[PDB]
Amino acid sequence: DIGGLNPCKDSEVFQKRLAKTVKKLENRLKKYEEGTPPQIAIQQQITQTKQRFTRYADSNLLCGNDGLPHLITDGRWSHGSEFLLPSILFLYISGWIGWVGRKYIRTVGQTSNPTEKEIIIDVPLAISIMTSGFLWPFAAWQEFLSGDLIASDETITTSP
Amino acid sequence: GDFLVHHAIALGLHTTTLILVKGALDARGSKLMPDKKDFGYSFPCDGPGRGGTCDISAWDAFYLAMFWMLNTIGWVTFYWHWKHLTLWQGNQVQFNESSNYIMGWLRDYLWLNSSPLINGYNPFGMNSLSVWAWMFLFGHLVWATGFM
Amino acid sequence: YTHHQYIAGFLMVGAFAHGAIFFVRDYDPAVNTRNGEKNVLARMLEHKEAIISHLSWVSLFLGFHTLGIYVHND
Amino acid sequence: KSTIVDFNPVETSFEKWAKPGQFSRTLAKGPKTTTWIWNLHADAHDFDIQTNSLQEVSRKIFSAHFGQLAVIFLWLSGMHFHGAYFSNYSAWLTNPTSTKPSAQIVWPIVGQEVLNADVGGNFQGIQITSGFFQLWRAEGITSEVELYWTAVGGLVASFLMLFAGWFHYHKAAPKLEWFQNVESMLNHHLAGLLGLGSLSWAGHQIHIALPINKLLDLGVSPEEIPLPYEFILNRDLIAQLYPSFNKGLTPFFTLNWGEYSDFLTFKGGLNPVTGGLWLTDTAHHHLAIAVLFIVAGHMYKTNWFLGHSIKTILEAHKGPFTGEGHKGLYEVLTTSWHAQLAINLALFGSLSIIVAHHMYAMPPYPYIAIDYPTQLSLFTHHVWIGGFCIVGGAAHGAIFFVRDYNAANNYNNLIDRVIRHRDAIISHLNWVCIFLGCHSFGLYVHNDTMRALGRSQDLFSDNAIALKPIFAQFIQNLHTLAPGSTAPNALTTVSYAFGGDVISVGSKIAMMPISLGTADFLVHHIHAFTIHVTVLILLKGVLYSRNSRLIPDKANLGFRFPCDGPGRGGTCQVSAWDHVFLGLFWMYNSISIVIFHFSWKMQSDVWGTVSPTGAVSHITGGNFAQSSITINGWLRDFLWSQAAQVVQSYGSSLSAYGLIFLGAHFIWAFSLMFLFSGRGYWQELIESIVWAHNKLKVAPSIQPRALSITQGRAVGVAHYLLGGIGTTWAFFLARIISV
Amino acid sequence: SHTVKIYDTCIGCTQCVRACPTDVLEMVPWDGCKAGQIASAPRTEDCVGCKRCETACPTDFLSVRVYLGGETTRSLGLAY
Amino acid sequence: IQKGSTVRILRKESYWYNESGTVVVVDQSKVRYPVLVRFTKVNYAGTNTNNFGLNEVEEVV
Amino acid sequence: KLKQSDFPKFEGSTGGWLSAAKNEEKYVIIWTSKDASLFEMPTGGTAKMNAGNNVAYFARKEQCLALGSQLRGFKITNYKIFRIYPPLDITLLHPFDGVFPEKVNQGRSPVGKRDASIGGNPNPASLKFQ
Ligand code: CLA
Numbered sequence A: 001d002i003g004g005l006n007p008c009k010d011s012e013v014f015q016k017r018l019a020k021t022v023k024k025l026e027n028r029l030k031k032y033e034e035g036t037p038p039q040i041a042i043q044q045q046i047t048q049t050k051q052r053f054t055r056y057a058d059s060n061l062l063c064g065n066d067g068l069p070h071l072i073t074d075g076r077w078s079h080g081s082e083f084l085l086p087s088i089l090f091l092y093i094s095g096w097i098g099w100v101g102r103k104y105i106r107t108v109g110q111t112s113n114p115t116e117k118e119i120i121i122d123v124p125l126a127i128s129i130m131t132s133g134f135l136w137p138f139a140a141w142q143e144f145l146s147g148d149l150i151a152s153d154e155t156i157t158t159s160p
Numbered sequence B: 001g002d003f004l005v006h007h008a009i010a011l012g013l014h015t016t017t018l019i020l021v022k023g024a025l026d027a028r029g030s031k032l033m034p035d036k037k038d039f040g041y042s043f044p045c046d047g048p049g050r051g052g053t054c055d056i057s058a059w060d061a062f063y064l065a066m067f068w069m070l071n072t073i074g075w076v077t078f079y080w081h082w083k084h085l086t087l088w089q090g091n092q093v094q095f096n097e098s099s100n101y102i103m104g105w106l107r108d109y110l111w112l113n114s115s116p117l118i119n120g121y122n123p124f125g126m127n128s129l130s131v132w133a134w135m136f137l138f139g140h141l142v143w144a145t146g147f148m
Numbered sequence C: 001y002t003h004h005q006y007i008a009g010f011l012m013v014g015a016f017a018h019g020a021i022f023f024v025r026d027y028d029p030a031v032n033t034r035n036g037e038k039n040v041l042a043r044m045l046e047h048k049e050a051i052i053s054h055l056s057w058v059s060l061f062l063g064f065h066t067l068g069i070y071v072h073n074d
Numbered sequence D: 001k002s003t004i005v006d007f008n009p010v011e012t013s014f015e016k017w018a019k020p021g022q023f024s025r026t027l028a029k030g031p032k033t034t035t036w037i038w039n040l041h042a043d044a045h046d047f048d049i050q051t052n053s054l055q056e057v058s059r060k061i062f063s064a065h066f067g068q069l070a071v072i073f074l075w076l077s078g079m080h081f082h083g084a085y086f087s088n089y090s091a092w093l094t095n096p097t098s099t100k101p102s103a104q105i106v107w108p109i110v111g112q113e114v115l116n117a118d119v120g121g122n123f124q125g126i127q128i129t130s131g132f133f134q135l136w137r138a139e140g141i142t143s144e145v146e147l148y149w150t151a152v153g154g155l156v157a158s159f160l161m162l163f164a165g166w167f168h169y170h171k172a173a174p175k176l177e178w179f180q181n182v183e184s185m186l187n188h189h190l191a192g193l194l195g196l197g198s199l200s201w202a203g204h205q206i207h208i209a210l211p212i213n214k215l216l217d218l219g220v221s222p223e224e225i226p227l228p229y230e231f232i233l234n235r236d237l238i239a240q241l242y243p244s245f246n247k248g249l250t251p252f253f254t255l256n257w258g259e260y261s262d263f264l265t266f267k268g269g270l271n272p273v274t275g276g277l278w279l280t281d282t283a284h285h286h287l288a289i290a291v292l293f294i295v296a297g298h299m300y301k302t303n304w305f306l307g308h309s310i311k312t313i314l315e316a317h318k319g320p321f322t323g324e325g326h327k328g329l330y331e332v333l334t335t336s337w338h339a340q341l342a343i344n345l346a347l348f349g350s351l352s353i354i355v356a357h358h359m360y361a362m363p364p365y366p367y368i369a370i371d372y373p374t375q376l377s378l379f380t381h382h383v384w385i386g387g388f389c390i391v392g393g394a395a396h397g398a399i400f401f402v403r404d405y406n407a408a409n410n411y412n413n414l415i416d417r418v419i420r421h422r423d424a425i426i427s428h429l430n431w432v433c434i435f436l437g438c439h440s441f442g443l444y445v446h447n448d449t450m451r452a453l454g455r456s457q458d459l460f461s462d463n464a465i466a467l468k469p470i471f472a473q474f475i476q477n478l479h480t481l482a483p484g485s486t487a488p489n490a491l492t493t494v495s496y497a498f499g500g501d502v503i504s505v506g507s508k509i510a511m512m513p514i515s516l517g518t519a520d521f522l523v524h525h526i527h528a529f530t531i532h533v534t535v536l537i538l539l540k541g542v543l544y545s546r547n548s549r550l551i552p553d554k555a556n557l558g559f560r561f562p563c564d565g566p567g568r569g570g571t572c573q574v575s576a577w578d579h580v581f582l583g584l585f586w587m588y589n590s591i592s593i594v595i596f597h598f599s600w601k602m603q604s605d606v607w608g609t610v611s612p613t614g615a616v617s618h619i620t621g622g623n624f625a626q627s628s629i630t631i632n633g634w635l636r637d638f639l640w641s642q643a644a645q646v647v648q649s650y651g652s653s654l655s656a657y658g659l660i661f662l663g664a665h666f667i668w669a670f671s672l673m674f675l676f677s678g679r680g681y682w683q684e685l686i687e688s689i690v691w692a693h694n695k696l697k698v699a700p701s702i703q704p705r706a707l708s709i710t711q712g713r714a715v716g717v718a719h720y721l722l723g724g725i726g727t728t729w730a731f732f733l734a735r736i737i738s739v
Numbered sequence E: 001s002h003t004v005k006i007y008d009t010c011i012g013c014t015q016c017v018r019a020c021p022t023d024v025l026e027m028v029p030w031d032g033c034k035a036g037q038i039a040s041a042p043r044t045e046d047c048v049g050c051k052r053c054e055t056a057c058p059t060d061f062l063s064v065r066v067y068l069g070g071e072t073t074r075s076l077g078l079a080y
Numbered sequence F: 001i002q003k004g005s006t007v008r009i010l011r012k013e014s015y016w017y018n019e020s021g022t023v024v025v026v027d028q029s030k031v032r033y034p035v036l037v038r039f040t041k042v043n044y045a046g047t048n049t050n051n052f053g054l055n056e057v058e059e060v061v
Numbered sequence G: 001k002l003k004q005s006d007f008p009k010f011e012g013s014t015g016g017w018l019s020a021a022k023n024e025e026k027y028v029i030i031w032t033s034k035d036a037s038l039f040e041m042p043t044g045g046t047a048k049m050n051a052g053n054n055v056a057y058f059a060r061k062e063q064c065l066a067l068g069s070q071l072r073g074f075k076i077t078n079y080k081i082f083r084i085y086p087p088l089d090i091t092l093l094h095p096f097d098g099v100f101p102e103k104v105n106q107g108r109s110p111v112g113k114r115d116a117s118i119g120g121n122p123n124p125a126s127l128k129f130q
């Protein structure tokens, strides 16, 4: 399909990889005894390996000639769960972190001892700001509009 | 593997450019030395004052960026040589599988292909590759003297 | 290929080093400025902090994520 | 109102916990730049600059020692708890030669359960190379319940040491005169601590370890072995194994000590069953050590008209060549903690290295000689600790010279006379270092270039120009002839390394004569050269710590400073700290070469398997003799060859070793950023980053500053040491566990 | 010999003069500051370039500046 | 400008260039740099105050 | 024991002057002390002052000045440093006008003073080929 890849559900090398891993795990399982915790752990390993391979097969995942899932990150929504949705999730979380950090910096920057409140965090104010970051996309595009997001010329510059 | 190594190459290019551009633009002065132009392109430092001013000259930016240029060219040449060794030997599947992780590089390029070179001379004999093993050790020695 | 790539890296580093030397000893702000306004080259020293900050951001971005993917695969 | 302690000196309060940097006069005002954060941790234990009173520094040191001992006790309790709960110690007891010791199981997350290896005995976990199983077996511990109780005792002891530290800083802190009773302290540490510890351990060995281990070697399973207390309440369970307890303590009090030859032997060699030292020999050794140390503890005058005064001993040792001699040394060592730390750390690291040597040389634990990973790990770890401690002793000698050295109090004594001719010492040490390096390494390079040129008869090899270590071979011959000639009451040599028979346990070689040839000559001279260069750096740091021809007032700049400036052609790293930094680098080099020599020589010419007919086959096959004489040989037949197991560990239970190999390479290369660069570039880059932050109104109030020059060097050396030592750690462990 | 220059931002706090290890700087009368004194560099032939002088300078970007130049046995700190 | 006034530093070779500081005292004598300004951010040398000329400071509204 | 009676009671160190301070220049520091205090040499170790005139020779001006700075801790202030060329060419150096350089003395002219701040320095491109 895309880039010459093929779905992993029809990739023979993918099933060969699964079979080889299961065979190695079973051979390891053979050298232990009865329902002893080592055998239980190896059986859990086998079950998890089978579940992971089955989930990857039924996941709209494209496999190359090596039988490994390749990620299609050109931007198409068909393979949108590989990069685009995790990209949105990370952008949300990281914007949350950056927004709460910036808000805390600007909030304790207007107190008597701004530097003290950076090594000794005001946990009440920190908790107040941190749970308010869920609106960071909206807060950012409400502070940029008011001109409160960017400094203009009070920023320092070197000699040249 | 080509994707990842191209991103590594892009990182190397960007970091070398960062060092060189920072040295060029900050050559005439900065906050730590707002009169750096009065000291010339290459000077040792401005002293231990103001927190310490090691490697503050523009020449030092070149000096630091030489390491990053060497690293970036090493990445580029490693990628090219491993790709073409796999292409010529026929085991292009070795690169396509092992080039996605660092241990793949270390084991299948360096450790694997260094065997003919180090056996250029052994306690049993030598080959026409003996000069290359001697140059290998010579390069390691000069590298570590640079470390000195 | 190795010889020419190493020569290429050397030449690029030399180009940037000589640009820095030009800034130190040959650049004249008066020539590159007309009535307060600065020309195309003198303006590179005005947003120099922006240029350096964004080069640093790109370098950190690429390094963090290339190393992250490589170590994840490892 | 006791005469030794002050009651309730410091109030137990949490107020100062909320004021970081309260100890320092400079840091108490609060952070203004990020340099304050780093200065906070760099001055935490520098009690000299926190108080102007030696009494307060001594009390802080005493409580810090208590905290450290509590930490050590907690670590030991954790080890015993892991042995009790997450180990296969019971399975290893019944099959020491076929079960690999494991005492740490790994949770099944993110696929990391592959690290749980097939250590044997129906167990999965990480193979343990600390030798705790062998130590516990030598202690007579035959059940995991005993390990649990030892862990509980360790926890109780750790709490006790924590309480002791709190008590002796906040409730009853000793006075300076109590700390300065060096005669009483030496008497107690020599008699009580050392001698009575040896005596108590000899008692434990005789009454618990001797019978239990004898029963274990006889084939008695641990379940039918009597509980250890039964060997004390019943004089018949121990009198069957050693038929001399039937006479009781009467032979001891009647001076008929010959009766106790059953369990106080002098045999030498190794136990043929376990491959370790005879535990009867060990008990006799500890008894003799106890008596010797108790006797040695009655030397210094403390509270009666009896004993020696160290001041009178030192002041009487003058000479024509040494002026006032040792006059003033007693005042130096009773008023400066740094001098005591220097001496103690140097001798402590040297002792650690000696311990490392004597460990593999004469394996003291059952079934530890045939556990090659344990032997390699123990040797390498102890040598590393010794090197670090020696560098620390040199560092604190330099610190004493900078801070606590008084010129007036040391007029024409040994310290003064050493400083007065420091040039001669350093110049001759420089010449010796150049001579040794030229010779050792250039003989290596000559061998390499002769081999590369196809001239095999021009090498410094055994089949060529030969450099036989005749002096060491003479000593080896003297030791193998000692039993019956110079040690007439010995039955076997102290170690089979000096010569004798091949000792094998379960077809695995425990010890064997270590032949010394031209390959050992070169590597021994390499060791001497590296040690001499490290000594050169550290001694130059100590002697030139106060002044020099460059900076006549270097003592006024302190122990830790980056430079004096770019003048005088450049005055980088003139400190004494910058000498402990370079000396750390050279100690890393020396110890790395030492452990490489040990690993290759043992694998190639000691360790291996013995065929039923007596044929010895080694791990590598004797390639050390002919291929360790060239640098290409070290690169190929040792590094490249034995790195195969590390690089091929992916997908196996040793994959963690490959991951740590790669990560240690990464950290070592990371160090070079700090080692090669300078502070100005990073400060000017932080300037642009701060510009971006200010543009986005997110510049921190604590101004971000690049790490100071000294801190940059410290970070570089710490990362370099961590990366190199971790790379060698992963390489050694993977190689010696795989094979 | 190195070059040492003094700038009128001098506040006459004398910290440069009492930090010079080779007696290069001295305090001379002046009328440009409250203290009525300014640093001078009349013995730059003894200047070693250690830059202790400008490590003790409290003014914003320094009032004493050391420009390293030609080297001499005095400026190189050679006891031999 | 006077004591307590807020000024912007116009000296280019300044750790507080383009930044705002508080005037501690303006000397009335014939000194070259009478204006003494205190800042919240310490410079690279650790100081937080400096003397400025009358043309190197601009009062904030 | 020693060549001159005013020398400090020093046992000699292999850190003193070399062949340079016999053909290029040597520096001598003189001072008078009330007590025979024990002080540390800038070169080697501990020496003993004379209760009176004291004279010491060094290879560098910095060594003599470090010794003088140490002398200030002994409440000694009258120390004076001279430069001696290969022959007896004595030149008073440290108390040049009899007043220490840290104290303002009339009769001193400013040397190396620029009537502007750092920002007034000329651009290097305008200082090419002179
Ligand atoms: C939490 C606040 C915060 C915010 C909003 C930003 C924002 C920014 N930083 Mg930044 N930074 C921060 C903290 C922050 N940083 C810290 C703590 C450090 C020290 C490690 C840095 C080091 C740093 C460098 C070296 C660079 C940036 C750069 C940048 C810019 C591009 C984004 C980027 O590369 O991310 C960079 C982010 C990191 C390197 C990791 C930050 C570390 C953690 C995740 C942040 C700290 C969280 C904090 C403890 C939360 C506490 C708040 C709570 C008490 C309420 C952007 C203006 C780049 C730039 O100038 O581009 C224009 C650049 O080169 N920053």
Ligand code: CLA
Pocket (backbone or CB within 6 Å): B041, B042, B059, B062, C010, C011, C012, C013, C014, C015, C017, C021
């Ligand atoms: C055609 C290209 C070209 C030209 C005309 C110049 C010309 C110049 N450069 Mg320049 N440069 C170049 C390329 C060039 N460079 C490149 C590619 C780089 C990057 C590496 C640099 C980096 C650079 C720096 C950093 C500096 C100059 C400087 C200078 C100026 C003085 C040069 C000098 O003093 O040489 C001195 C010559 C030497 C010290 C000889 C060095 C020889 C090296 C170490 C190689 C020799 C070892 C050899 C390989 C032995 C083999 C070992 C064996 C075992 C195999 C001069 C105007 C300097 C200056 O002040 O400019 C104003 C200065 O600071 N350049």
Ligand code: CLA
Pocket (backbone or CB within 6 Å): D061, D062, D065, D066, D069, D178, D179, D181, D182, D184, D185, D188, D189, D191, D192, D193
């Ligand atoms: C026979 C008496 C005796 C014994 C056994 C010890 C033993 C010890 N002393 Mg000690 N000491 C003694 C007498 C004694 N001292 C006297 C008379 C003085 C006064 C001059 C000192 C002054 C002194 C100082 C100043 C320091 C020590 C330290 C130490 C420890 C060294 C660390 C070590 O080797 O770890 C071995 C550890 C063990 C074997 C663990 C078990 C040891 C336990 C705690 C028994 C300790 C015996 C104790 C004195 C009994 C008092 C109980 C109390 C209720 C009165 C060690 C525990 C150092 C230390 O670490 O501080 C804590 C230290 O800094 N001692």
Ligand code: CLA
Pocket (backbone or CB within 6 Å): D041, D042, D043, D044, D045, D046, D047, D345, D388, D389, D390, D391, D392, D393, D395, D399, D559, D560, D577, D580, D581, D584, D718, D722
């Ligand atoms: C008995 C051992 C001992 C003791 C009591 C001391 C005590 C002291 N040393 Mg010292 N030292 C020692 C051993 C010791 N040292 C050794 C073995 C060395 C050689 C490396 C040194 C080298 C040394 C130097 C070079 C200096 C000191 C200094 C000091 C003083 C301040 C220490 C401080 O505040 O650090 C606080 C503690 C820290 C800052 C901890 C730093 C963290 C370390 C560096 C990294 C550890 C990594 C760890 C292994 C985990 C890595 C694993 C990784 C995967 C994460 C203090 C008197 C300093 C001083 O000024 O003395 C007056 C000083 O300049 N020492």
Ligand code: CLA
Pocket (backbone or CB within 6 Å): B141, B144, B145, B147, B148, D429, D430, D431, D433, D434, D435, D436, D437, D438, D441, D442, D445, D533, D536, D537, D582, D583, D585, D586
């Ligand atoms: C492989 C790299 C390397 C090498 C070769 C050396 C070599 C040396 N270091 Mg070291 N050093 C290194 C890395 C290295 N270092 C690093 C990375 C650091 C950073 C921490 C240091 C830090 C350091 C310190 C701090 C000190 C040394 C010292 C020494 C010298 C010890 C005396 C000696 O053996 O001289 C003999 C020279 C050699 C063994 C080098 C090889 C010479 C060959 C084999 C013989 C002669 C060849 C012949 C002349 C060639 C002629 C032909 C040619 C003209 C074409 C020696 C020159 C000490 C010193 O100054 O010397 C006493 C010292 O104090 N080093």
Ligand SMILES: CC1=C(/C=C/C(C)=C/C=C/C(C)=C/C=C/C=C(C)/C=C/C=C(C)/C=C/C2=C(C)CCCC2(C)C)C(C)(C)CCC1
Pocket (backbone or CB within 6 Å): B024, C015, C016, C018, C019, C020, C022, C023
């Ligand atoms: C895709 C394509 C295309 C296009 C292409 C292009 C468009 C390219 C471009 C390219 C480019 C566009 C490149 C560039 C590069 C650049 C560079 C490489 C630069 C560098 C720089 C430097 C080095 C600088 C220097 C300096 C300084 C630093 C300052 C002073 C001055 C000077 C200048 C000296 C076509 C259509 C054709 C076709 C095919 C496809």
Ligand SMILES: CC1=C(/C=C/C(C)=C/C=C/C(C)=C/C=C/C=C(C)/C=C/C=C(C)/C=C/C2=C(C)CCCC2(C)C)C(C)(C)CCC1
Pocket (backbone or CB within 6 Å): D076, D077, D150, D151, D152, D153, D154, D157, D196, D199, D200
């Ligand atoms: C393992 C461990 C532990 C444990 C330990 C122990 C358990 C110990 C014990 C110890 C002991 C248990 C000791 C004992 C001792 C005793 C002694 C030391 C005694 C002595 C005696 C004597 C000396 C006497 C003498 C005499 C007299 C005086 C009189 C009569 C005569 C005679 C001669 C007999 C813990 C948990 C902590 C921690 C971890 C590790």
Ligand SMILES: CC1=C(C/C=C(\C)CCC[C@H](C)CCC[C@H](C)CCCC(C)C)C(=O)c2ccccc2C1=O
Pocket (backbone or CB within 6 Å): D673, D674, D675, D677, D678, D679, D682, D705, D706, D707, D708, D709, D711, D712, D713
């Ligand atoms: C990068 C660099 C800096 C800048 C380095 C800085 C500012 C350190 C920043 C450390 C961050 C802020 C905290 C550490 C973050 C790590 C992720 C934590 C360590 C990892 C744990 C597992 C220990 C210097 O200041 C410097 C000074 C002198 C010589 C070389 C250098 C140098 O190379």
Ligand code: SF4
Pocket (backbone or CB within 6 Å): B044, B045, B046, B047, B048, B052, B053, B054, B055, D562, D563, D564, D565, D566, D570, D571, D572, D573, D678, D709
């Ligand atoms: S900064 Fe680096 S170079 Fe400049 S003086 Fe201090 S140490 Fe020497």
Ligand code: SF4
Pocket (backbone or CB within 6 Å): D567, E004, E019, E020, E021, E022, E023, E024, E025, E046, E047, E048, E049, E050, E051, E052, E053, E054, E066
């Ligand atoms: S360098 Fe600075 S300190 Fe050293 S002498 Fe010249 S001026 Fe005085």
